[model samples]
Target: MPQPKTFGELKNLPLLNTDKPVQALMKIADELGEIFKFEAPGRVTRYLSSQRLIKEACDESRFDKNLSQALKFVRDFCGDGLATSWTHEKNWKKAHNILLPSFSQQAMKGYHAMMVDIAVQLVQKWERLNADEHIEVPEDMTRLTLDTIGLCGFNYRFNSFYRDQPHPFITSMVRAMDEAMNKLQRANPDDPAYDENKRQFQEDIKVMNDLVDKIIADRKASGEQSDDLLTHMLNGKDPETGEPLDDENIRYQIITFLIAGHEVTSGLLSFALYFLVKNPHVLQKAAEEAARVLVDPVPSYKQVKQLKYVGMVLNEALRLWPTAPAFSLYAKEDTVLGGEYPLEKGDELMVLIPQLHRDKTIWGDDVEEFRPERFENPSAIPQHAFKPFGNGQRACIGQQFALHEATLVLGMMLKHFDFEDHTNYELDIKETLTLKPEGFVVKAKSKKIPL
Candidate 1:
């Protein structure tokens, strides 16, 4: 009778440290053992750290993707869009098929110029800063990605580079998303502040709605024919269903792409820069690859693929800190995890990605070290072992979008600037719906000679 170690009383409140929840989960996995259980009042949730458990969980037959706490909040805003919708969602299937081709390799090639257009804007923006000026990594990455997704996905321009502050749409969307996730922390609905908070949250949501509505209306009025996502959604037919996405679902898809599309990628670029700066030798190698590959002002589509090492660096960064740090799964029927720990139907499990990634058995003795070579042979890694994007049918559809943009932007940055850790800042992660380095700062020295 093998059972998981229990951290606290099953009848008690949600256990495990909350101050740094993911890290606390990792700490528990380290001390307690591979599989462990914690209680959250009515439900008992398990966390899995072993590769074997993760592999078994990946099997869609016995286990299926659950909309984790954070994403359930995302659904409140995004509706039945791909990332947030339940597995049984009809619109999710329709939108997923209709738009899947838009993200195809050939389709991404169609977006190369636009991606390069955004990447170069960031490089040029960095060019204006003083040689010793500290560049806030995540801030700039967010601006870059927001603008990229805007142009590439919607044929719209956030003009994030030209603005002094983020667009009003982003401000409201961020506030709304922040409040949405904040709902999980508050156990009290009776608190006096909760009403005020709810009011502000709904207001922010309306702001986002007005902007997305305007964008949709503006496109309809202009009658422009473009190959971007907006056009595809406006005209796309589900290959299997032969039904077009309804107007409401189209708006949800736009909001979903705008949120899911940029947030994780922005974090990826920032984390990649953090890792590169900390490991100078790695940075030097990455810079050399950038210099060798980016001979022109921007990386051409062909040149982007030549940035293999830069891609590996991004892979390693994600391995260490997957921005969407955790995803939930539930048993499809009565099942056992790792052939021992029995899980009843509806029992939830949160896969601790950091621990799964740092599995000593799979990643070796120096699992904590930053090494890009570990990804040099991607196939050498076993199935369901390194899921930065996620797993199965419900995995991220914009994976190529994120990877392409990050690779191009990172390579361009490494090519044109040398990053320095002048402040000697230690890494601290902050979480809203996603994770980013809190107070992570680095200075950029221009590699280009003064004209």
Candidate 2:
């Protein structure tokens, strides 16, 4: 087996030095060819930087998810919930089984009504705001998705739109997540600022825990016979074992759902909207598609599916930005990857998704272009070329749910209002566990005339 080329040095890790780590990593991928090792103080992490290599590495029999790096930081709060759990954990298997049904198409039909209920709040808020007001795209998208998850998953209403400020939960949650990522990048217990940051991070996590606890306690005592996620987890028994999720495990699952269910989807919506506004022709086509499909004010589940062009726009956005960004994998045993690079047992590799998505051999030279038409034949596209959600059985459980919610909200927004990059903000991504277009803002113009 051939050894892969290596980058960086023990004294200076290039990945740690960049503010835009994702793009910096992509540059390194472009320079290093298919695979390379990233040098660190005590660790040398390998990266699969191309589509073909990623496909080979994704073989579940030989490789499995590695929950180190960013995900390890995520586990500080998420615990053994689905996303951060080790593959072999009993709780992961049991919770996955119990929660799987809740994210199905039939379940999405139930969740769609709640999705529209929140989306209407977004549209109406934009409708009432002065035309000059620059709407913070990511912030508003976060509010929309967080509320949708709260209502659809737990039968609780965040009423995020009703408040002048974002819900305390979201504020504290983002702060905590930011701190986690910060500590991952640069942590020194002896630094004078470390103690203060750590203290606030802990407090922010407490706020998150407190709210999640209230939701759980409220559901338990209320005895409301609803099929929301909280109800499912509390009463659901693993099919194999016929046992309910324990309280602490259930709590972790709730936090996982809250984080996983909203953040990435919110970024998806934000970037999709950003793309639509930037590409006028695509926006016009998507708006036309939305107007044709969404005859009613709120789209039905079937109508949501019918907005094929809108879905394509999302596909294109994910191909470029991939808000979830990168997922890590580890070799199950000593093996050779892509028939060339050698791997030892427990050796981990991060899949650089942006680089993989832009593989010129697969996506062609217009890889950086936001062309939704490329997704017209979704099934015909090569496998492993695009992995915004992830791979295999451990792929995002909320995959369909996120797309449904994003497509529905995007269709509604496009149909009801015209978006403009009022500030002419260029794409500047911010990474905190997930990648988002930081400081992206757009102004909305109401397309409807009141009777």
Question: Best candidate, lDDT-wise?
Answer: 2
TM-score list, all predictions = 0.94, 0.95
How many steric clashes does model 2 contain?
Answer: 0
Model 1 misplaced stretches (Cα beyond 4 Å) = 1-19, 449-451
Where does model 2 exceed 4 Å of error? Answer: 1-14, 190-193, 449-451
lDDT of each: 0.82, 0.84
Clashes of each: 0, 0
Task: Give residue 78's error in model 2 in angstroms.
Answer: 0.5
Candidate 2, residue 212: lDDT: 88
User: How big is the positional error of residue 200 in model 2, measured in Å on the Cα after superposition?
Assistant: 2.1
Of candidate 2, the 10-residue stretch with the lowest lDDT total is 1-10
Across residues 52-145, which tens digit of lDDT does each residue of candidate 2 receive?
9899778889889888567887787788988999888888889989999888878888889898898888888888898589788898898899
